[PDB]
TrEMBL record, chains B, E:
<protein>
    <recommendedName>
        <fullName>Genome polyprotein</fullName>
    </recommendedName>
</protein>
<comment type="function">
    <text>Protein 2C: Induces and associates with structural rearrangements of intracellular membranes. Displays RNA-binding, nucleotide binding and NTPase activities. May play a role in virion morphogenesis and viral RNA encapsidation by interacting with the capsid protein VP3.</text>
</comment>
<comment type="similarity">
    <text>Belongs to the picornaviruses polyprotein family.</text>
</comment>
<comment type="function">
    <text>Protein 3AB: Localizes the viral replication complex to the surface of membranous vesicles. Together with protein 3CD binds the Cis-Active RNA Element (CRE) which is involved in RNA synthesis initiation. Acts as a cofactor to stimulate the activity of 3D polymerase, maybe through a nucleid acid chaperone activity.</text>
</comment>
<comment type="subunit">
    <text>Capsid protein VP1: Interacts with capsid protein VP0, and capsid protein VP3 to form heterotrimeric protomers. Five protomers subsequently associate to form pentamers which serve as building blocks for the capsid. Interacts with capsid protein VP2, capsid protein VP3 and capsid protein VP4 following cleavage of capsid protein VP0.</text>
</comment>
From TrEMBL, chains C, F:
<dbReference type="GO" id="GO:0043657">
    <property type="term" value="C:host cell"/>
</dbReference>
<dbReference type="GO" id="GO:0046718">
    <property type="term" value="P:symbiont entry into host cell"/>
</dbReference>
<keyword id="KW-0946">Virion</keyword>
<keyword id="KW-0945">Host-virus interaction</keyword>
<keyword id="KW-1160">Virus entry into host cell</keyword>
Automatic annotation (TrEMBL), chains D, H:
<protein>
    <recommendedName>
        <fullName>Genome polyprotein</fullName>
    </recommendedName>
</protein>
UniProtKB/TrEMBL annotation, chain I:
<comment type="function">
    <text>Component of immature procapsids, which is cleaved into capsid proteins VP4 and VP2 after maturation. Allows the capsid to remain inactive before the maturation step.</text>
</comment>
<comment type="similarity">
    <text>Belongs to the picornaviruses polyprotein family.</text>
</comment>
<comment type="subunit">
    <text>Interacts with capsid protein VP1 and capsid protein VP3 to form heterotrimeric protomers.</text>
</comment>
<comment type="function">
    <text>Lies on the inner surface of the capsid shell. After binding to the host receptor, the capsid undergoes conformational changes. Capsid protein VP4 is released, Capsid protein VP1 N-terminus is externalized, and together, they shape a pore in the host membrane through which the viral genome is translocated into the host cell cytoplasm.</text>
</comment>
<protein>
    <recommendedName>
        <fullName>Genome polyprotein</fullName>
    </recommendedName>
</protein>
Length: 247, 290, 237, 30, 290, 237, 247, 30, 49
């Protein structure tokens, strides 16, 4: 016989171990593989698809009203419209997105993001907006003079009703953590603010309040690691008809 | 176009741009396509050689985690005056992935899945005075869906002519089996937009081709003079996984295992009319640095 | 260039001038079932131009507090034309779909539609643990109305529904959406009267709004089956 | 390490680095 | 200049020296350089072929010793009338290397460390009359830092969808896991001269990138009619170690794990104003041969 | 030959005649961040001669019972010149430092200074288990004073502090010390307002002593940042 | 199957065993290695750096006064100034050094040492010292006639304010033990004494009491083996906030 | 003996005999 | 601004180069000393130690 000795870790069940185990059905022939459309082989394919932000996560926004921001004609210049907190761990506008749900299965993240905004006013509606990204450090900028000093894009509503604000990966560390401290230097991403560059100017038969829809995806330099269970789902009891699977 | 991606992609340096006829930051959401604006085209970038690997978000790694699928405690004792609705030293379980919600939401990120499932069974025992824990032998017999399951601990269905049984003890390492890909189709339907019978009275959403089988587990021992409480936890790990057509994750809490019904929580987050918890205004910043 | 599009199938054609670049679902185009994936051994009927043609459904009124509309495929077409006669006389079925959705208004109107094709859209019911019945699901040509389109009537989310093959009808940009669907099933063929492979969902993400004269704005759905096969000839149910 | 006679008995296959994001991000035809 | 050193260096013979302009025994401490006076230049030497290997003082060998990092005893019993500040058949532990001072002073000989940590978990049990020791099953679940940890023994967070759990018994060999290098930087900061938040109210010296994670350990069994005291000892062994910028060792005793505060002992040795115990004069020899 | 040294950075120069051979920390010299170690993808600003120049701090009085002085970097320079304006307008930061410390006296004076640059000098407090606060650490341009320099204010030892990049100012040998520091962090760039990579410590190991006339002896610190990069342009805090 | 049998030592946990164990996180990608200055790959790199001796380990020497020896002008010839005990295990002047702290993690040691002395008087201060090393056997030499018969160096204070006393490896055995018996023949290293060779001669404006600072490093023939825990650190209770890592 | 699919799972790497003491003992420039 | 630090030792002299830093090619000897075409700047000396 072969002289052996057992190591520490013998007989344990790690839930992430990668071994071969006993076939319960020998000489079983699985069904032949058929081509099915839309195979996913890496979850970063899913994360690069744009999905709507709930920027209007306020009360008196009921259901689908949370998925759009209503901008109007203003009588003062340089006015703030909305801002977006960029914490993907924390329950903000970025949580229920394709980039936000798959990332909460992980703890560390890296890479650039993109914010796409589609203007959903009338053809007659004109206007210009500035979409600023501010790297972290201080407070969120509240005036336009303060906010345009960071990464921005000026967007006129015309024949193309969409822009992209690339949110660049500007970090000291290779990765950022999904830690509970949103004000941490390893977690805080910065801020996105939108201002009037000119004004939303409509005629008398366009609806005077127009809408934006914000989208967020990840770019192809995006990366996730350290896998954990999602805080988005959970139970304190067995589900209905789960006892009937034992009957 | 399909390519092999082992690390995240590199950044190239860019310069001042000022060209008529070229507007890469403008896009068309209406086509259904995601924006292809690169970070080189929006800001001025530097050269970054990105060495961040992407292997942990592989669908094989994302899903091959052993997850709890079944948890059943039964009293192991002499069952003569016990009611007939109880588990008289054995239980039956129709194998599903719907009962525990971490694996359920994770598998329901896809429309179709083809995987082999390795099955770890963890048995634990407690005294129902204290005199010691017995080293009992358990039998887990894999019965296919709809076939004859045993009605007793000592029934003659446990002899397992062709049904695969595993016999294992409590003092051993946990029993581990690999169940193959057993669907009559080329993938499991995680969602089934249909009715599984030719009459208009069948169940909606339940395809019995998706069902693996029954897992009949008994204690091979006879009863001791004292009782014990035996908890059998079953762990499933998918492997050799192909996945098709990804889906929105479930936001509202699950109500049942039979269907995708929803109620939502009473307040935000994850309420019916409010998935994300509320802030004061759209120009209010929740964790603003002071 | 991508705004003008003529779709010619059979004796049916659709010209549009205010369109987007059309969507092929998952990069795939429809085809017939090849021999190395076939299961049923009898020779299928491929009626082509009798069934591979646009079928226009009843229009729906886009109103003030609309929540959305859904049609399940092939259930929405199982009683229409020679597609419905090949469905009712055969046991098996395989095809893709070319869905074209039409909605126009003036240049003083605003609004956005999410026109999304969902595979295997198993629905849920609200505030009950009883599953939806047959009549809740198999509506037919009229289709249904979303109850809670913010969670897509299944507990998930409208925000992440752009993972499915979709387009938008933003009324200042386009007035039509076109999604080409292939066969989307775990089986190569299927019994068309008890299973739906695709759900066309049309959802008011931005509601209809104007301050000009009030006209009725309809949303019209033309669906063309593509590469129909039918196996298992019998009588009609 | 696979000494079993069935191919599905083997360990997990974590070497599939083929991606195609364009079937979700650019499904348009032109 | 970097070279490969496997043994200590050899001595060459030297002779009578008497040269003007050459003074190798004189040096310049003020430059910050260590003296390069060789023993051949100070005395007359012989040829010694030195075969003494140097492999035991390698930083890989110096640090890869399994050291105790956690020791937690909890009462394993029925917890209904127990206070809520106690460990009701489970505990949580934020993984740190600061709690036990042999590994702490040894790791704090460096400013930066990059290592993989293998984690051995040793469970021991005692009866809280005597009737025997149960062979209990324990679950150690690795939760990342700041994530949701379980609040019960039988909570639904223990199902471990994606959190890695190890299930192990008391009669087994101890459970052993390898935890990777999990910092978001290229090395762990053993010392952090900074504040970890963008506000002026954060903690000094605590970088949460340095924190490995949480280690939630429960007993999977239910309570027996008698109680037991379960002690779980966790052992960490660094491996694949790179180390940068060495530091003075700590002389004074540690006060806390959160900081590098100092008090010193009351008398020498290792007092604040006297690290080395005292002698009578500078010309007094303590262990003088008589 | 090694006693005379001119250090020319920007519009700033320092000639010294009574120096030692200068110290490059860990054998390393400063450089810019290369592309294979870069993380932040935007183009950094490299202001060079506007920031890569000597910055002289306030002198300290070397007296009878002095314990020592410390300055934390880049905190001691975050409000000085165009280095401080690039610090306050950017999120990220990377540079090395050329520290030059000046202290002269007559040939009848005695004394020795340990001029030591400590990486990640996490301080401790004395006789309490509460951590040092923000104001105990982030002194700024004035720096701090050692409380117990015999244990380096962190429980360790002054005797073993020659493991760090150091020089000596022995007043009979030299009157200046020069330490060239590279970037010393686990991250390639860093937020300069909440983290200090280097601490310059100057410690009276042998106190000042003479029997001639009493003059004030100052200790002056000139710090030149080297190869400054700044990423993440925004407003100023 | 393979016929096996378990050896003695099966299932044990040695704390110094060198085996491969189960990855808790499969397919985890660690952070890319960055060049950090000052890598240590062997602890004998640290041991060769000179560090200050507490030769003045007396009472009424408080704190930093222990790190210097105050010499003065004397009125007698051949006078002893200080001596240094060379036991590295024992709490003497060599314990809190870089050579002294790393060696107390080990039990056996070998190799040459160096004592560097920096004179920190004024420029005007002249003088000559003799720094004697005495191999073991007898008492420590108290007169200069007795002490110069061993290894010594005569040092004049001038333009170079430093000398090195090489303490040669003069031992019968290959290694010396860090045993508790300081008077053992396997442990005792010998003695270092310093004498006036001439006198410390200063003028009337130099400070009449000048200082030395003693340094000790190891040479590159130095070697340590048999690793043990250090007697320099220890606890009789849990530290503060250690219970809060469980809360 | 390493039958795990991750490289960090391996045993300790005790073959790094490269030294450079001159970055601590002679850090001067000339 | 432009400076030089000078220790008094074996060489008892330094040079402060005053660089030509002007917008124009030449500067005028006009009566207005506070003019932008005439004012050169300032030289100051401080105690370094």
């Amino acid at each position: 016989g072969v002289p052996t000795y057992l190591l520490p870790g013998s007989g344990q069940f790690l839930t992430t171990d990668d071994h071969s185990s006993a076939p319960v059905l020998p000489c079983f022939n699985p069904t032949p593989e058929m081509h099915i459309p839309g195979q996913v082989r890496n979850m970063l394919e899913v994360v690069q698809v744009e999905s709507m932000m709930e920027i209007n996560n306020t009360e008196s926004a009921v259901g689908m009203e949370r998925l759009k921001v209503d901008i109007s004609a203003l009588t003062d210049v340089d006015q703030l419209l909305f801002n977006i907190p960029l914490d993907i761990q924390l329950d903000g506008p970025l949580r229920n997105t394709l980039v936000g749900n798959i990332s909460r299965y992980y703890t560390h993240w890296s890479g650039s993001l993109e914010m796409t905004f589609m203007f959903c006013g009338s053809f007659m509606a004109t206007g210009k907006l500035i979409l600023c990204y501010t790297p972290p450090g201080g407070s969120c900028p509240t005036t336009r003079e303060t906010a345009m000093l960071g990464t921005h894009i000026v967007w006129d509503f015309g024949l193309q009703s969409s822009v992209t604000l690339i949110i660049p990966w500007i970090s000291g560390s290779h990765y950022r953590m999904f830690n509970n401290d949103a004000k941490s230097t390893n977690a805080n991403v910065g801020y996105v603010t939108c201002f009037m560059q000119t004004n939303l100017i409509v005629p008398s038969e366009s609806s005077d309040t127009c809408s934006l829809i914000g989208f967020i995806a990840a770019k192809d330099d995006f990366s996730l690691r350290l896998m954990r269970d999602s805080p988005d789902i959970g139970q304190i009891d067995h589900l209905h008809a789960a006892e009937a699977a034992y009957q | 176009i399909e390519s092999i991606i082992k690390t995240a992609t590199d950044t190239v340096k860019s310069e001042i741009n000022a060209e008529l006829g070229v507007v890469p930051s403008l896009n068309a959401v209406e086509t259904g396509a995601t924006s292809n604006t690169e970070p080189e085209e929006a800001i001025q970038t530097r050269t970054v050689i990105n060495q961040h690997g992407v292997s942990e978000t592989l669908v094989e790694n994302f899903l091959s985690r052993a997850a709890l699928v079944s948890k059943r405690s039964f009293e192991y004792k002499d069952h003569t005056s016990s009611a007939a609705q109880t588990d008289k030293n054995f239980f039956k379980w129709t194998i599903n992935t719907r009962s525990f919600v971490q694996l359920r939401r994770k598998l329901e990120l896809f429309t179709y899945l083809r995987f082999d499932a390795e099955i770890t069974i963890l048995t634990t025992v407690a005294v129902n005075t204290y005199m010691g824990l017995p080293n009992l032998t358990l039998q887990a017999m894999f019965v296919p869906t709809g076939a004859l399951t045993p009605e007793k601990q000592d029934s003659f269905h446990w002899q397992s002519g062709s049904n695969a049984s595993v016999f294992f003890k409590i003092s051993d390492p946990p029993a581990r089996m690999t169940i193959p890909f057993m669907c009559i189709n080329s993938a499991y339907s995680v969602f089934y937009d249909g009715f599984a019978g030719f009459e208009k009275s069948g169940l909606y959403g339940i395809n019995p081709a998706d069902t693996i089988g029954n897992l009949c587990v008994r204690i091979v021992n006879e009863h001791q003079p004292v009782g014990f409480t035996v908890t059998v936890r079953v762990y499933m790990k998918p492997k050799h996984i192909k996945a098709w057509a990804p889906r929105p994750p479930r936001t509202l809490p699950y109500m049942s295992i039979a269907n995708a019904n929803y109620k939502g929580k009473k307040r935000a987050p994850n309420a019916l009319n409010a998935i994300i918890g509320n802030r004061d205004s759209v120009k209010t910043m929740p964790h603003n640095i002071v | 260039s991508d705004r003008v599009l003529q779709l010619k199938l059979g004796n049916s054609a659709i010209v549009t001038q205010e369109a987007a670049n059309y969507c092929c679902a998952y990069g795939e185009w429809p085809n017939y079932l090849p021999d190395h994936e076939a299961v049923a051994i009898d020779k299928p009927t491929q009626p082509e131009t009798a069934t591979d043609r646009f079928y226009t459904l009843k229009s729906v009124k886009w109103e003030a507090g609309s929540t959305g509309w859904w049609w399940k495929l092939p259930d929405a077409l199982n009683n229409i034309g020679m597609f419905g006669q090949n469905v009712q006389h055969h046991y098996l079925y395989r095809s893709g779909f070319l869905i074209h959705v039409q909605c126009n208004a003036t240049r003083f109107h605003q609004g956005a539609l999410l026109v999304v094709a969902i595979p295997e859209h198993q629905r849920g019911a609200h505030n009950t643990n009883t599953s939806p019945g047959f009549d809740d699901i198999m509506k037919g040509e009229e289709g249904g109305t979303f109850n809670h389109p913010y969670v897509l009537d299944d507990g998930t989310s409208l925000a992440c529904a752009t993972i499915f093959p979709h387009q938008w009808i933003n009324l200042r940009t386009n007035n039509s959406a076109t999604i080409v669907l292939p066969w989307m099933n775990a089986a190569p063929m299927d019994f068309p009267l008890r299973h739906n492979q695709w759900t066309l969902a049309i959802i008011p993400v931005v509601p209809l709004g104007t301050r000009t004269m009030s006209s009725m704005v309809p949303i019209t759905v033309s669906i063309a089956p593509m590469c129909c096969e039918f196996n298992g000839l019998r009588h009609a149910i | 390490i696979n000494f079993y006679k069935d191919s599905y008995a083997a360990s997990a296959s974590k070497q599939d680095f083929s991606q195609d994001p364009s079937k979700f991000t650019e499904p348009v035809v032109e």
